[PDB]
Design an enzyme around this catalytic site. Structure first.
Site, short mmCIF file in Angstrom:
data_model
loop_
_atom_site.label_atom_id
_atom_site.label_comp_id
_atom_site.label_asym_id
_atom_site.label_seq_id
_atom_site.Cartn_x
_atom_site.Cartn_y
_atom_site.Cartn_z
N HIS A 1 0.81 -1.20 0.00
CA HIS A 1 0.00 0.00 0.00
C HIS A 1 0.85 1.26 0.00
CE1 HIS A 1 1.02 0.99 4.17
NE2 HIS A 1 1.02 -0.32 4.35
N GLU B 1 -2.13 -6.87 7.82
CA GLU B 1 -0.77 -6.78 8.26
C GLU B 1 -0.58 -7.66 9.45
OE1 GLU B 1 2.08 -6.98 7.98
OE2 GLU B 1 3.09 -5.11 7.66
#
Lengths: 197, 197
Positions: free
Chosen positions: B9, B79
């Site tokens: 990202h 994550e």
């Protein structure tokens, strides 16, 4: 802020056929000349010094990248020799005892009957590269070289085992960069080919 | 011709600060939005299916890449949890029994006291990615995720030793591709960032 940039040369005819091209001085194809230009553009001169293999496919690539810098030849940056494999495709090597050891990591993954292997070339090429970085500390260094040579350098630099070689695929004009943290090379990119259309 | 593409990202503020950023659902900075646009512009819809982490920073990035395609949310693309480490810079982690292990390699490099290590995540994340590929054969797969997640995925996919994690450096919007030969993943790019202007 030492930055190492390794760049595989542009496309040759032998590359297109899959023929192991070691010490044979094949020239770039016309597409390969274009790959060199496109990668020169991406760089846009963002480097302090530029080194190259003496083989024309590398040297010509390096010269486009350099624009107006001198291109330093290093004989140790020539491609790894492949002996009796030269000219052959990997399909033509099935059932060569040495090639089964290449795929298998036995004996350090020997290259043909050259006396050398992925293991030796890794130490050897990693050693060269470090000294070249100590020589030019806090600079951005470019090295135009070949596929077997650059791959072994990655394995040498990051201390990987010989078999990891087969888990990399490095195309023409692919960029691979390192930096250092603290004294150890850190891979910040591998085979970047976004400059290819 | 199965292609797997892993994309980190865009930038966040915590990225800017060196703050471990796991479960906290931090938005992108305008730069990080721009990043996302850029990486989308480079990808030009050249993919078949696109998956994403649920966390905002990823989804927003995937969304820009996906265009009018559906972004498929995978909970396991989130994550890695960092537990106590969360919200801290590595400097602050100077002197933790676990952080030393994270560098030294002990106990497969633990993250905080989450009970998991790099070792464990390498196995787990690879198993997911392999399955996502076995289910999408002869297609190009994009997956938008996070720094630690992707890095362990690499170690898992290429079967590397957990300490190698520190020899890789991944940037925001960094691209990382794999193909299969015969059925083994082969890395063909890591952290390509040419799209950043």
């Amino acid at each position: 802020m030492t930055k190492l940039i390794l760049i595989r040369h542009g496309e040759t005819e032998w590359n297109l056929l899959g023929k192991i091209q070691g010490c044979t001085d094949i020239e770039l194809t016309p597409n390969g000349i274009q790959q060199a230009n496109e990668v020169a553009q991406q760089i846009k001169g963002n480097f302090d010094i530029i080194y190259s293999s003496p083989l024309h496919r590398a040297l010509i690539t390096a010269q486009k990248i350099a624009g107006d810098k001198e291109v330093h030849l290093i004989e140790g940056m020539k491609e790894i020799p492949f002996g009796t494999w030269e000219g052959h495709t990997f399909e033509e090597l099935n059932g060569d005892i040495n090639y089964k050891k290449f795929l298998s990591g036995e004996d350090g993954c020997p290259f043909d009957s050259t006396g050398m292997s992925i293991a030796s070339w890794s130490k050897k090429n990693a050693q060269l590269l470090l000294d070249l970085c100590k020589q030019n500390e806090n600079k951005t260094i470019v090295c135009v070289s070949h596929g077997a040579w650059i791959k072994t350098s990655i394995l040498g630099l990051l201390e990987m085992e010989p078999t990891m070689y087969h888990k990399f695929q490095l195309g023409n004009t692919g960029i691979t960069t390192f930096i250092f943290r603290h004294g150890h090379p850190v891979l910040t990119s591998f085979n970047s080919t976004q400059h290819l259309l």
